[PDB]
PDB file of N, CA and C in Angstrom:
ATOM      1  N   UNK A   1       0.605  -0.798  -0.549  1.00  0.00           N
ATOM      2  CA  UNK A   1       0.073   0.166   0.558  1.00  0.00           C
ATOM      3  C   UNK A   1       0.660   0.930  -0.004  1.00  0.00           C
ATOM      4  N   UNK A   2       1.986   0.800   0.960  1.00  0.00           N
ATOM      5  CA  UNK A   2       2.351   2.652   1.102  1.00  0.00           C
ATOM      6  C   UNK A   2       4.573   2.097  -0.188  1.00  0.00           C
ATOM      7  N   UNK A   3       4.561   2.141  -1.130  1.00  0.00           N
ATOM      8  CA  UNK A   3       6.124   1.822  -1.561  1.00  0.00           C
ATOM      9  C   UNK A   3       6.791   3.148  -1.785  1.00  0.00           C
ATOM     10  N   UNK A   4       7.371   2.868   0.286  1.00  0.00           N
ATOM     11  CA  UNK A   4       8.400   3.554   0.418  1.00  0.00           C
ATOM     12  C   UNK A   4       9.852   3.613  -0.111  1.00  0.00           C
ATOM     13  N   UNK A   5      10.051   2.809  -0.310  1.00  0.00           N
ATOM     14  CA  UNK A   5      11.567   2.381  -0.927  1.00  0.00           C
ATOM     15  C   UNK A   5      11.596   2.902  -2.557  1.00  0.00           C
ATOM     16  N   UNK A   6      10.464   2.589  -3.036  1.00  0.00           N
ATOM     17  CA  UNK A   6      10.147   3.108  -4.541  1.00  0.00           C
ATOM     18  C   UNK A   6      10.397   4.696  -4.519  1.00  0.00           C
ATOM     19  N   UNK A   7       8.958   5.039  -3.371  1.00  0.00           N
ATOM     20  CA  UNK A   7       8.938   6.669  -3.823  1.00  0.00           C
ATOM     21  C   UNK A   7      10.398   6.552  -3.277  1.00  0.00           C
ATOM     22  N   UNK A   8      11.577   6.722  -2.390  1.00  0.00           N
ATOM     23  CA  UNK A   8      13.178   7.043  -1.826  1.00  0.00           C
ATOM     24  C   UNK A   8      13.636   6.354  -3.030  1.00  0.00           C
ATOM     25  N   UNK A   9      13.659   6.163  -3.917  1.00  0.00           N
ATOM     26  CA  UNK A   9      14.222   6.130  -4.714  1.00  0.00           C
ATOM     27  C   UNK A   9      14.083   7.351  -6.465  1.00  0.00           C
ATOM     28  N   UNK A  10      12.697   6.932  -6.579  1.00  0.00           N
ATOM     29  CA  UNK A  10      12.326   7.360  -7.955  1.00  0.00           C
ATOM     30  C   UNK A  10      11.844   9.056  -8.144  1.00  0.00           C
ATOM     31  N   UNK A  11      12.094   9.613  -6.371  1.00  0.00           N
ATOM     32  CA  UNK A  11      11.097  10.812  -6.423  1.00  0.00           C
ATOM     33  C   UNK A  11      11.813  11.676  -5.106  1.00  0.00           C
ATOM     34  N   UNK A  12      13.190  11.219  -4.194  1.00  0.00           N
ATOM     35  CA  UNK A  12      13.923  11.253  -3.177  1.00  0.00           C
ATOM     36  C   UNK A  12      15.141  11.275  -4.060  1.00  0.00           C
ATOM     37  N   UNK A  13      15.789  10.814  -4.993  1.00  0.00           N
ATOM     38  CA  UNK A  13      17.189  10.934  -5.103  1.00  0.00           C
ATOM     39  C   UNK A  13      17.952  12.172  -5.810  1.00  0.00           C
ATOM     40  N   UNK A  14      16.865  13.207  -6.290  1.00  0.00           N
ATOM     41  CA  UNK A  14      18.276  14.267  -6.048  1.00  0.00           C
ATOM     42  C   UNK A  14      17.631  14.803  -4.694  1.00  0.00           C
ATOM     43  N   UNK A  15      17.317  14.979  -4.228  1.00  0.00           N
ATOM     44  CA  UNK A  15      16.583  15.227  -2.810  1.00  0.00           C
ATOM     45  C   UNK A  15      17.648  15.296  -2.553  1.00  0.00           C
ATOM     46  N   UNK A  16      17.471  13.730  -1.866  1.00  0.00           N
ATOM     47  CA  UNK A  16      18.494  13.001  -1.159  1.00  0.00           C
ATOM     48  C   UNK A  16      19.615  13.672  -1.333  1.00  0.00           C
ATOM     49  N   UNK A  17      20.575  13.791  -2.633  1.00  0.00           N
ATOM     50  CA  UNK A  17      21.355  14.341  -2.737  1.00  0.00           C
ATOM     51  C   UNK A  17      21.599  15.968  -2.002  1.00  0.00           C
ATOM     52  N   UNK A  18      20.711  17.319  -2.056  1.00  0.00           N
ATOM     53  CA  UNK A  18      20.789  18.363  -2.516  1.00  0.00           C
ATOM     54  C   UNK A  18      20.547  18.221  -0.291  1.00  0.00           C
ATOM     55  N   UNK A  19      19.572  17.408   0.295  1.00  0.00           N
ATOM     56  CA  UNK A  19      19.889  16.816   1.798  1.00  0.00           C
ATOM     57  C   UNK A  19      21.097  16.831   2.381  1.00  0.00           C
ATOM     58  N   UNK A  20      21.466  15.831   1.749  1.00  0.00           N
ATOM     59  CA  UNK A  20      23.689  15.475   2.869  1.00  0.00           C
ATOM     60  C   UNK A  20      24.143  16.519   1.864  1.00  0.00           C
ATOM     61  N   UNK A  21      24.246  16.714   0.907  1.00  0.00           N
ATOM     62  CA  UNK A  21      25.614  18.177   0.954  1.00  0.00           C
ATOM     63  C   UNK A  21      25.136  19.221   1.256  1.00  0.00           C
ATOM     64  N   UNK A  22      23.461  19.019   1.663  1.00  0.00           N
ATOM     65  CA  UNK A  22      23.453  21.070   2.321  1.00  0.00           C
ATOM     66  C   UNK A  22      23.003  22.404   1.690  1.00  0.00           C
ATOM     67  N   UNK A  23      23.248  21.455  -0.552  1.00  0.00           N
ATOM     68  CA  UNK A  23      23.132  22.705  -0.895  1.00  0.00           C
ATOM     69  C   UNK A  23      22.791  22.370  -2.156  1.00  0.00           C
ATOM     70  N   UNK A  24      23.149  21.500  -2.707  1.00  0.00           N
ATOM     71  CA  UNK A  24      22.296  20.560  -4.338  1.00  0.00           C
ATOM     72  C   UNK A  24      23.651  20.507  -4.552  1.00  0.00           C
TER      73      UNK A  24
END
């Protein structure tokens, strides 16, 4: 019902890079 891993990979990918670097 909640496809969290797929959502993280296919929608949070560049967002994850931006939040880790703090600066994109």
